[PDB]
Design a protein around this ligand. Structure first.
Ligand SMILES: CC(C)(COP(=O)(O)OP(=O)(O)OC[C@H]1O[C@@H](n2cnc3c(N)ncnc32)[C@H](O)[C@@H]1OP(=O)(O)O)[C@@H](O)C(=O)NCCC(=O)NCCS
Ligand SMILES: CN(C)CCNCc1[nH]c(=S)nc(O)c1Cc1ccc(Cl)cc1
Ligand SMILES: [Mn+2]
Ligand SMILES: [Mn+2]
Length: 217
């Protein structure tokens, strides 16, 4: 039933909530990150971290703040990788151990057409042709944008570098999989080279969820 659980391996616990339940709070160390934020932002931040802490508890990790790094990236405990996402109708998190996976990224979007002008900004010309050839009945433009955001989220923890929308070519398969081919230097922080990712996608509850797990070497 859960969207994230449907697109990541069993080894990576996940948790998701479709509403902001009443009474949640950030941990004291997290409060400065949203002290001057509007209610919508405070709620997505608090609810997604409740989900992340639930998934971390399944790995045996007790309650811990999840702060943000210089490029907005969540800062996980030592030996943990993870990803978080929030959109209207969805808050979710997924975590894993570094001995079991290299990286994970997820992104949730509403299953709707992209806003005017966004596809032109994010898609390579060949991607635009590819999407037009896919079967009718799915918002392929929104799925491409979702998959590209998941691509940067899986990439950043391994490279500490920017990955623009024009820096990767995503190919969507109607069967619930996609591939991301990196078009820039793929040197990773540990000296390895990243060239391509394998992704999974699902559409349910009016939402698109994309996920990439970069597997153990
Ligand atoms: O899907 P969304 O765009 O909502 O995800 C936003 C999340 O991406 C994550 N994210 C932001 N910058 C990121 C980066 N450079 N790399 C990886 N994940 C990142 C954050 O956890 C953010 O949620 P937060 O600001 O509440 O922590
Ligand atoms: C602000 N929220 C909505 C998140 C969206 N932005 C994040 C973002 N988007 C794209 S397209 N590519 C990326 O690599 C990054 C992360 C990043 C930022 C800056 C640097 Cl320098 C390095 C990595
Ligand atoms: Mn969000
Ligand atoms: Mn998104």
């Amino acid at each position: 039933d859960q969207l994230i659980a449907s697109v990541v391996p069993e080894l990576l616990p996940s948790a998701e909530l479709y509403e902001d339940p009443p009474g949640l709070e950030p941990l004291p160390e997290e409060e400065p990150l949203i002290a001057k934020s509007v209610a919508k932002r405070r709620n997505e931040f608090i609810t997604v971290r409740y989900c992340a802490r639930q998934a971390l508890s399944v790995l045996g990790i007790p309650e811990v703040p999840i702060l943000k790094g210089d490029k907005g990236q969540p800062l996980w405990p030592d030996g943990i990788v993870g990803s978080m996402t929030h959109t209207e109708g969805f808050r979710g998190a997924v975590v894993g151990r570094t001995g079991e996976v290299r990286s994970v990224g997820i992104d949730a979007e509403p299953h709707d057409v992209l806003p005017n002008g966004v596809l032109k900004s994010i898609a390579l010309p060949v991607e635009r042709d590819e999407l037009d050839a896919l079967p009718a009945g799915t918002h392929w433009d929104r799925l491409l944008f979702c998959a590209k955001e998941t691509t940067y989220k899986a990439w950043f923890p391994l490279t500490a570098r920017w990955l623009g929308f024009e820096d990767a070519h995503i190919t969507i398969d109607p069967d619930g999989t996609f591939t991301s081919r990196i078009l820039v230097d793929g040197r990773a922080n540990d000296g390895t080279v990243l060239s391509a990712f394998d992704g999974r996608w699902i559409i349910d509850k009016g939402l698109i969820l994309t996920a990439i797990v970069v597997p153990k070497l």
